[PDB]
Design a protein around this ligand. Structure first.
Ligand SMILES: Nc1nc2c(ncn2[C@@H]2O[C@H](COP(=O)(O)OP(=O)(O)O)[C@@H](OP(=O)(O)OP(=O)(O)O)[C@H]2O)c(=O)[nH]1
Ligand SMILES: [Mg+2]
Lengths: 1187, 162, 48, 48, 486, 69
DNA sequence: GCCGCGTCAGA
């Protein structure tokens, strides 16, 4: 029942009785969808006008100053990007698209009101506007050769919000929020007086605003309190409040008051605030299209506030999802573009002031400098923008879906506590509550749920199924958060009689958004899926319901930190969410059209597509694999093809898995037999014990790639040389170094070995007389140059997979450098030309097959089109400035070195289970020592039972029993296939193994005998089982599976100690306990330091291990030392150890000498503090007191 | 005795891709490690040369039948070739025992192409023993699972001698 | 972390740099005494 | 805390302060008047 | 801040074989920390005549260097510290022994004072250069020196988790066992019998014990006679030092009992005897626990048989209250309070029922069937007190029941679901708010405690003892602080 | 060490530490480190504690030693 | 003599 090539190769058992009403929506849709609306217009969507085009149209007309010049926008043209994303990243250039717009200017006599501009400037031209960054189909941005992801931002929606502080009774408040600009506020008072403020200022009556414009007793109390006599007086008072100590002006105040709230550019609602305000007052008379504030709107807001004080109405909830909206990265890009456009418009108005030309074209006035800088500044320095995590494919999906309220317009980390961190009732359908940072940012990540979707207004919506006449309809609809509160929704778990009618009279459902017991008749909707509430990352964990929420959150955060192994192993127990996660992430290749593989090699895939069952196409497509691609986490990424020659394939099938993917399924862990008994105190707490077979079998070995860059710069004294000709260096050390001075590719480098050699000149050596005598005795000259070669840090071992060199610009290349560059270009073009010919040769063979079928004009230009791309590829390599980059002026040359070193799990490493149980390996034991079953198979890992009782992670025990059942099922299949390997009996054995339990009915009959033999070989290690997160198989089904395996109906089994061979009293549960390794190696954490460089300002040691590191001494540690009374330890550590320059040298000499002496005259930091005080008028000095 | 060193005809490092080969160089090394070898008592160390021009799938049996060298895993395939090509490599075989991961010498490499390969010397996959009493005497039953490189009775005698 | 903390003093000899100079200076004086009775040592000190 | 206000009050008063404390000694890198430090002083007084 | 050189940060390992005063240090870290001392020793040895020559030899990691490092660090103390130094006990001094690997190893008993666990926690090591500092740290900063908490007399070196569980399992007795009623003259004879394995550890035997005992007045008297004891208690007899009565060992040996025994040994025997006894107990517990091979299984937890009937009765009561409210006879607030009380009572009854079945096992022994204490692993762990608590057992085999909202008012609907049977999506969502609120509270509270401790240190920082007697006769009146109920 | 044996002769645990430090400094300045005995025996600071435990040195005698130096 | 508005300063 696999129905797919990936499914056909291995068949995974499935569980649960819930039908799949709707398939999961695309995970990356939210990131991809926002960019398209900004850069594209769809008639069906109704997005006729692109946002960028609308922004250009709004500010295009200027009419500077009666110059007979008119600026009109005609059209926008987008230039093709110079380099593809793969080429841009290798070069380090940022993927970008040129933006061009058409401006028409009309000129004429420019007389006083006659024929000013109707007879001139009939000529118009396209003017370059700037460079716009482009988004890949994966929705990621490459900047400076670095991939980046912009997190979505959640911000309070523009509108009118009424809230009352409880400090005083009747203290209601009215707030109006604009999309941009200042927002006015109204505050009630204990006396019942009304006050109006703008953002911040002196308190004043709200009546002043009405005076400027032109059962209620509140107006009477407020009117008498204010002494304002006329609107002019009120306007002068408002101007004085806005600026203090500034004289009022007759026309100055009028322009300022209208400008603050009556300027369209200055103040706009964005069409969201106006829509909310009209709905809140329910008035259609005010124009919805105009986003500017109106006198009627302000009077209505004041009326609503008075009505709330009367007691008719309800206060709004800020925490409510409907009030909060999510802002896409493209909207931020649009805002930056608008700011740049405003600056450009101001420049154009100023630019017209100087004219020195005849029939001047409208190209000189346009300036593109302002727009490019703002967008680049936002992308490079954007707080929301950050490097995407490369640890695993799941991590990349988690980061893109993440929405952060933090950033501009966002609450500060310490500002908001105990309010936004909680989960609202509306959060169930929009944001998964089990996933959040355990750090202070906890409760702000608000990771988006898998089924969560974004409406055009930016409000998240959740799919639901309507119910008619007590009968559930199959129609699926999306409900807004505000709409959802009124309706009552029943959970999908509720059973049906097959007529879509609820059997139970009383069911648990949310009518007010809070779970309650209600009759089936009142229910109006049903949940589309059980896992809809949980996030996509949460669904991966099996037996989620059995696990505690805190432990589940800890496990979910830990799984994303998992590090990929050399061989991917599919988990025996899986929710089945892994296959969707792998397909959605672009780490695997999917065939565009149905075709039969023509040639397969581990560098590219060639496929031929049949036109009869497919739309018209070239008939040949080529897919290029990526081998050992470097990652931000320094994790090797490579793609291996699962396709075979002459293998039928269909669109959407995975030709080959790429990163952390096995057979189209994401695997971050290896299955190991696990026992649950305390051993010798090796795991007293969270410690984990490893048999060592995994270390020997390379079960947990990972490959890390390290890039080292050496650059050459021109100093004032001289230009530094990377040539490997350094005095005082032996030939054997330089023997690995090539004649060019760059280490040979593929050559193992010991720690501290020279990767590149550089010499920098020195002057005014001023050698001391003893040094002079030494030079005279040996006739030794003093070098005027010093060597600063690049060497790998100690404790690091690797081989050089790739070497990159960039030459100088504007300088003719040397024969070795110039010849090397030409040779590299020819090899890339020559390999491409032969490779391009190979594709051309395959097309020619296909034509020969179709020679009877007419190819004379059918593919005449097909070869020509391929030739143009090859020429462009040759041009692109020579299209560079000659250094492959600008290089930054003052940089002579740069070199890039890539080293890949394998890593194997060792003691002190950290392993975290999917259930959230985590441990650090304490020791490695011999295979004989590890406990074994009566069969004698060893137990790879032993776990502590006490920890499971303390934390309710009951899911892990159930998974271990399920894993044991899967292990038992595999052994029976191995016994059946060990002898008499015939398809007919194997089919019966497979029917018993899969159809014995469950209603899945895999229908293995469809698979041919040849497929059956491969499937049996694949299942030898284990039989895959898929469990729904809330639809997991019950204990009875697992017990039946254990019986089929022939194991007793319990997890525990008899075991014998290896050392004495005597069985332990009491049986011990054995489970697969699938495990993953977190990215926390102990190799980089050792941080051993004895003597290190000191901070220049404080003469104190550097920290963090960046250079020599060292451990800072805490103030609390000083308190503990004072409690101990060890003054000698405290005094010595503070002076000689840290800032005593005289003491440190003396201490080092004494330690080398071995003689005992102590000098602690003073600490340098105290002297620096006295100097800082001395600069101020206050004077601090040491003194002697005889009094 | 297991292979400790393998040199490819055209490779500079383990992380490289040969033309028209589905398997990766690291994947080829992994296939090589699982290979089981039986050696003569006095051989101690020997070098094996494999050269094939087959357009099909390369195999351990493809290894040249030199004297002394014995390959138990004929079925295991070293690599698969998509298109016809010339493939050759040299693997060094020496007698060894597992002294633990910490106490392991990396092994010197003289040729630039030489690649270090870890080897599992021990051949006994599983050992099981049981005791039956006949009355005034007992009979010891031991179940031994091996790659088949060494006959079980000889291995039992060697263990008792040690 | 901030850029100012990263900057380190490069104009001042490190203690290991200070220690090696002391051993070399002490060794030379012993050598001069071990050699000429007094005239050669005096001449070497005066000229250098 | 409140360093600026305390410094401003002290400067006008021209206060003369004996360290008389464990914290004052630590800033000057001097032995605190407690634990081993008091014992060393008492032993020194006996030696005199 | 005073960042200091000669300091190292590394991961911490269980290091059980290590002694109470001994710790495990990676060789590379030790070489870097003692590199100047190694250079001095090499110059003294004459292996290197110059500092540069010594550095070059050290760079190549010559074999002779390791032996010199071992001699230099043979009697040299080191200081281990943690990022949160809440109390002086957190910083302690241990003698380093060179070990392979980059993972630091520390004694398990010292971990409780450190308040750290092997979950990836990292520690920092500092080395004292001065002769006075190194001697002073050994005299007062040594782990052996600190046994009782500074705040309280209770010892901080007591076993915390598994070591207590193994002792509790061995101490337990069985009414019927092989070798029951056997008489053993000495501990060695009982140990030989256990090695044969014919007898049962839980079996009851009579042992004749003669040894000295120390009185409160300090008078020492000889204790002799025949006392019935469990096989495990007889095995534990060898570890106990002379001058300690066999009565303390002759009990269930629960974790509270072990701490009392340690305190009694320290008060009369002295600190050194107490440390030796603690190390012997730690060795015995690890060996016995592995032999017990206690395991945790889904079947071990048992759901109550009458739980369904209690749930139905509670639902019927809730329905009656709803019927009363619909008529308008009862106010909404009173109905809500009554429903909450009924749910709480039903949940408490369900929890009480679950404890009896798991704790009590009935077996058909010869002559009839009688109830005996259960040997279930979960009950032993909860009864032992090494890990877990009654509330966790109630939730796993009981029901979640009332769930507090962010306001903390109990939701009227309650969860009858349990972790073993799993929970509905709506019930899990209701439970999610409480866990999130607790996690948010834990992180925020950390800063307040530190700020309060800093203010207290500032107020009492200068206080110290300078004179033996003030000579004042004025003091305070002390009487029992009765709360009126106890 | 446990310092418990040293405490019987010395009182307060601070005077003992100071006396041990002075004795160790005197022994180091005595030229005891010929380098033929340091390897076979423990460091001098432990040696001073051992002498205090024997009680042969005498705390009062140690104070008299300071005047000699 | 006081209500009620305010600065600062730490979290
Ligand atoms: N396992 C263990 N041993 C302890 C314990 N307490 C003391 N010892 C051992 O007793 C010896 C006492 O050392 P000292 O410091 O000279 O005597 P002290 O304890 O009375 O001060 C130590 O010998 P050493 O010089 O450290 O080495 P060794 O002689 O034990 O080999 C130490 O190993 C303990 O709790 N557990
Ligand atoms: Mg922790």
């Amino acid at each position: 029942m696999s129905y797919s090539y990936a499914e056909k190769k291995r068949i995974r058992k499935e569980f649960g009785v819930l039908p799949h009403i709707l398939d999961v929506p695309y995970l990356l849709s939210i990131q991809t969808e926002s960019y398209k609306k900004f850069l594209t217009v769809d008639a069906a969507k109704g997005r006729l006008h692109s946002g960028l085009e609308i922004v250009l149209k709004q500010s295009f007309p200027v009419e500077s100053k009666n110059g007979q010049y008119e600026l009109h926008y005609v059209d926008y043209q987008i230039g093709e990007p110079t380099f593809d994303e793969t080429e841009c990243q290798v070069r380090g250039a940022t993927y970008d698209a040129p933006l061009n717009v058409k401006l028409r200017l009309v000129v004429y006599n420019k007389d006083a009101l006659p024929n000013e501009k109707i007879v001139e400037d009939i000529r118009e031209e396209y003017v370059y506007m700037g460079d716009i960054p482009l988004m890949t189909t994966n929705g990621t941005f490459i900047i400076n050769g670095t991939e980046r992801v912009v997190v979505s931002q959640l911000h309070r929606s523009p509108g009118a919000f009424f809230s009352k502080d409880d400090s005083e009774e009747g203290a209601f408040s009215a707030r109006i929020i604009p999309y941009r600009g200042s927002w006015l506020d109204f505050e009630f008072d204990s006396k019942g007086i009304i006050w109006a403020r703008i953002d911040r200022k002196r308190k004043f009556c709200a009546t002043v605003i009405l005076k400027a414009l032109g059962r209620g007793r509140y107006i009477s109390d407020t009117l008498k309190y204010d002494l304002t006599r006329n609107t002019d007086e009120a306007l002068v008072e408002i101007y004085k409040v806005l600026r203090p100590g500034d004289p009022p002006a007759a026309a100055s105040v009028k322009a300022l008051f209208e400008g603050l709230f009556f300027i369209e550019s200055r103040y706009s609602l964005s069409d969201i605030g106006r829509m909310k305000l009209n709905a809140r007052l329910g008035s259609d008379k005010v124009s919805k299209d105009i986003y500017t504030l109106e006198n009627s709107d302000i009077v209505g807001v004041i009326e609503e506030l008075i009505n709330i004080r009367d007691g008719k109405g309800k206060v709004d909830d800020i925490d409510h999802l409907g009030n909060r909206r999510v802002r896409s990265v493209g909207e931020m890009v649009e805002n930056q573009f608008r700011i740049g456009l405003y600056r450009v418009e101001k420049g154009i108005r100023e630019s017209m002031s100087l004219v020195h030309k005849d029939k001047l074209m409208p190209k000189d006035i346009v300036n593109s400098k302002p727009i490019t800088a703002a967008i680049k500044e936002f992308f490079t320095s954007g707080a929301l923008s950050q490097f995407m995590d490369q640890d695993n494919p799941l991590s990349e999906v988690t980061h893109k879906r993440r929405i952060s309220a933090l950033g501009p317009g966002g609450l500060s980390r310490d500002r908001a506590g105990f309010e936004v961190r909680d989960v609202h009732a509306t959060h169930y359908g929009r944001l998964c509550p089990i996933e959040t940072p355990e750090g202070p940012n906890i409760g702000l990540i608000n990771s988006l749920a898998s089924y969560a979707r974004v409406n055009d207004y930016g409000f998240l919506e959740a799919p639901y199924r309507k119910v008619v006449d007590g009968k559930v309809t199959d129609e699926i609809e999306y409900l807004s958060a505000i709409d959802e509160d009124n309706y009552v929704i029943a959970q999908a778990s509720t059973k049906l009689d097959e007529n879509n009618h609820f059997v139970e009279d009383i069911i648990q459902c949310r009518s007010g958004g809070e779970a309650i017991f209600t009759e089936s008749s009142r229910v109006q909707y049903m949940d589309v899926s059980a896992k809809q509430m949980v996030s996509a990352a949460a669904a991966l964990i099996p037996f989620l319901e059995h696990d505690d929420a805190n432990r589940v959150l800890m496990g979910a955060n830990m799984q994303r930190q998992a590090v990929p192994t050399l061989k991917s192993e599919k988990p025996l127990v899986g929710t089945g969410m892994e296959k969707i996660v792998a397909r959605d992430s672009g780490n695997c290749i999917i065939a565009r059209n149905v075709g039969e593989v023509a040639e397969v090699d581990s560098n590219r895939i060639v496929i031929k597509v049949d036109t009869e069952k497919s739309q018209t196409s070239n008939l040949v497509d080529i897919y290029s694999l990526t081998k050992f691609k470097r990652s931000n986490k320094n994790t090797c990424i490579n793609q291996r093809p699962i396709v075979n020659v002459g293998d039928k394939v269909e669109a959407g099938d995975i030709l080959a898995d790429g990163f952390a993917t096995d057979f189209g399924e994401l695997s971050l862990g290896h299955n190991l037999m696990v026992a649950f008994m305390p051993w010798n105190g090796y795991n007293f707490e969270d410690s984990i014990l490893l048999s060592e077979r995994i270390v020997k079998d390379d079960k947990y070995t990972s490959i890390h790639i390290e890039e080292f860059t050496c650059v050459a710069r021109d100093t004032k004294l001289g230009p530094e040389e990377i040539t490997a000709d350094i005095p005082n260096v032996s030939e054997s050390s330089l023997a690995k170094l090539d004649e060019s001075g760059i280490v040979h590719i593929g050559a193992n480098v010991e720690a501290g070995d020279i990767l590149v050699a550089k010499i920098t000149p020195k002057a005014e050596q001023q050698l001391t007389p003893e040094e002079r005598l030494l030079r005279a005795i040996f006739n030794e000259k003093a070098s005027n140059v010093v060597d600063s070669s690049l060497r790998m840090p100690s404790g690091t071992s690797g081989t050089v997979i790739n070497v990159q060199v960039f030459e100088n610009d504007k300088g003719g290349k040397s024969k070795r450098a110039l010849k090397i560059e030409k040779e590299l270009i020819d090899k890339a073009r020559k390999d491409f030309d032969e490779e391009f010919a190979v594709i051309e040769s395959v097309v020619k063979s296909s034509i020969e097959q179709e020679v009877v079928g007419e190819k004379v004009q059918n593919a005449r230009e097909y070869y020509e089109e391929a030739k143009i791309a090859i020429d462009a590829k040759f041009e692109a390599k020579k299209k560079s400035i000659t250094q492959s980059n600008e290089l930054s002026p003052g940089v002579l040359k740069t070199v890039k070195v890539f080293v890949a070193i394998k890593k194997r799990i060792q003691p002190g490493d950290k392993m975290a289970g999917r259930h959230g149980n985590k441990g650090v390996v304490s020791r490695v034991l011999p295979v004989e020592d590890m406990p074994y079953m009566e069969d004698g198979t060893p137990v790879d890992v032993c776990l502590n039972p006490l920890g499971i009782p303390s934390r309710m992670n009951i899911g892990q025990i159930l998974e271990a029993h399920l894993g044991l059942a899967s292990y038992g099922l595999g052994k029976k299949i191995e016994k059946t296939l060990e002898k008499t390997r015939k398809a007919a009996e194997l089919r019966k054995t497979l029917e018993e193994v899969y159809n014995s339990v469950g209603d899945k009915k895999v229908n293995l009959e469809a698979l041919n005998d040849e497929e059956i033999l491969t499937l049996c070989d694949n299942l030898k290690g284990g039989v895959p089982i898929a469990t729904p997160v809330f639809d997991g198989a019950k204990e009875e089904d697992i017990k039946s599976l254990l019986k089929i395996g022939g194991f007793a109906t319990n997890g525990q089994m008899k075991l014998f100690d290896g050392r004495t061979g005597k069985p332990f009293d009491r049986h011990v549960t054995v489970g697969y306990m699938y495990m993953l390794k977190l990215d926390h190696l102990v190799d980089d954490k050792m941080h051993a330091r004895s003597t290190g460089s000191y901070s220049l300002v404080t003469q104190q040691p550097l920290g963090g291990k960046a250079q020599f590191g060292g451990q800072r001494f805490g103030e609390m540690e000083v308190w503990a030392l004072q409690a101990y009374g060890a003054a000698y330890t405290l005094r010595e550590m503070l002076t000689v150890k840290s800032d005593d320059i005289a003491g440190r040298s003396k201490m080092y000499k004494n330690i080398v000498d071995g003689k005992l002496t102590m000098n602690v005259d003073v600490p340098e930091s105290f002297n620096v503090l006295r100097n800082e005080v001395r600069a101020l008028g206050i004077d601090m000095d040491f003194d002697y007191s005889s009094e | 005795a297991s292979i400790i060193k393998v040199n490819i005809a055209n490779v500079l490092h383990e992380y490289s891709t040969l033309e028209d080969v589905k398997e990766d160089v690291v994947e080829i090394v992994s296939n090589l490690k699982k290979v089981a070898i039986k050696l003569d008592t006095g051989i101690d160390r020997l070098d094996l040369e494999l050269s094939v021009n087959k357009s099909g799938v390369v195999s351990a049996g493809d290894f040249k039948t030199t004297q002394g060298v014995e390959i138990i895993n004929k079925d295991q395939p070293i690599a698969t070739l998509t298109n016809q090509r010339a493939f050759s490599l040299t693997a060094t075989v020496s007698v060894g025992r597992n002294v633990g991961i910490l106490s392991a010498i990396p092994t010197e490499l003289e040729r630039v192409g030489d690649i270090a390969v870890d080897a599992d010397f021990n051949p006994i996959k599983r050992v099981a023993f049981e005791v039956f009493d006949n009355g005034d005497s007992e009979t010891l039953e031991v179940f031994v699972k091996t790659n088949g490189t060494i006959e079980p009775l000889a291995a039992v005698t060697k263990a008792l001698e040690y | 972390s901030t850029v100012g903390d990263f900057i380190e003093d490069k104009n001042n000899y490190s203690p290991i740099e200070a220690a090696n100079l002391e051993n070399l200076r002490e060794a030379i004086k012993e050598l001069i005494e071990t050699g000429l009775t007094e005239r050669e040592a005096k001449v070497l000190m005066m000229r250098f | 805390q409140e360093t600026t206000r305390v410094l401003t009050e002290a400067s006008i008063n021209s206060q003369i302060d004996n360290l008389r404390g464990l914290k004052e000694n630590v800033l000057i890198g001097r032995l605190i008047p407690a634990g081993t430090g008091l014992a060393v002083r008492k032993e020194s007084a006996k030696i005199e | 801040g005073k960042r200091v050189d000669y300091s190292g940060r590394s991961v911490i390992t269980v290091g059980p074989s290590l002694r109470l005063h001994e710790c495990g240090l990676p060789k590379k870290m030790a070489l870097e920390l003692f590199k100047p001392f190694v250079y001095s020793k090499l110059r003294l040895g004459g292996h290197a005549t110059t500092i540069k020559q010594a550095k070059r030899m050290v760079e190549l990691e010559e074999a002779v260097v390791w032996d010199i490092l071992e001699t230099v660090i043979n009697e040299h103390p080191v200081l281990l510290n943690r990022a949160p130094t809440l109390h002086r006990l957190g910083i302690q001094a241990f003698e380093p022994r060179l070990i392979e690997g980059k993972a630091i190893q520390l004694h398990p008993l010292v971990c409780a004072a450190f308040n750290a666990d092997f979950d990836g926690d990292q520690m920092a090591v500092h080395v004292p250069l001065t002769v006075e500092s190194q001697l002073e740290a050994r005299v007062l900063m040594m782990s052996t020196n600190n046994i009782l908490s500074p705040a309280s007399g209770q010892p901080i070196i007591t076993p915390t988790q598994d070591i207590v569980l193994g002792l509790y399992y061995i101490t337990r007795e069985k009414e019927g066992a092989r070798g029951e009623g056997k008489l053993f003259s000495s501990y060695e004879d009982v140990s030989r019998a256990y090695n044969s394995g014919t007898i049962d550890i839980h079996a009851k035997i009579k042992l004749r014990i003669d040894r000295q005992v120390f009185d409160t007045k300090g008078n020492t008297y000889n204790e002799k006679g025949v006392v019935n004891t469990t096989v495990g208690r007889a095995l534990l007899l060898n570890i106990l030092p002379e001058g300690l009565s066999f009565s303390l060992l002759n009990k269930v040996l629960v974790k509270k009992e072990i701490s009392k025994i340690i305190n009694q040994a320290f008060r009369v025997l002295g600190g050194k005897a107490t440390v030796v006894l603690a190390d012997k107990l730690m060795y015995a517990g690890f060996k016995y626990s592995t032999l017990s091979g206690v395991s945790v299984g889904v079947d071990d937890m048992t759901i109550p048989d009458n739980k369904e009937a209690k749930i139905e009765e509670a639902e019927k009561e809730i329905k009656q209250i709803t019927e009363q409210y619909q008529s308008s006879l009862i106010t909404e607030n009173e109905r809500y309070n009554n429903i909450i009380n009924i749910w709480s009572k039903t949940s408490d009854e369900v929890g009480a029922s679950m404890m009896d079945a798991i704790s009590k096992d009935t077996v058909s022994i010869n002559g009839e069937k009688k109830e005996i204490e259960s040997f279930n692993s979960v009950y032993m762990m909860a009864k032992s007190g090494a890990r877990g608590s009654y509330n966790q057992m109630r939730q796993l085999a009981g029901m979640r029941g009332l769930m507090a909202k962010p306001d903390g008012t109990m939701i009227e609907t309650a969860i009858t679901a349990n972790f073993r049977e799993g929970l509905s999506v709506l019930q899990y969502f209701t439970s999610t708010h409480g866990a999130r609120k607790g996690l948010a509270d834990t992180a925020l509270k950390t800063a307040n405690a530190g700020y309060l401790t800093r203010r207290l240190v500032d107020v009492a920082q200068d206080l110290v003892v300078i004179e033996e007697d003030c000579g004042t006769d004025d003091g305070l009146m002390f009487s029992a602080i009765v709360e009126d109920g106890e | 060490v446990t310092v418990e044996d040293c405490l019987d002769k010395v009182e307060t645990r601070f005077d003992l530490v100071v006396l041990a430090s002075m004795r160790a400094n005197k022994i180091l300045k005595n030229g005891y480190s010929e380098s033929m005995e340091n390897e076979k025996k423990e460091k001098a600071t432990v040696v001073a504690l051992r002498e205090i435990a024997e009680s042969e040195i005498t705390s009062e005698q140690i104070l008299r030693n300071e005047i000699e130096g």
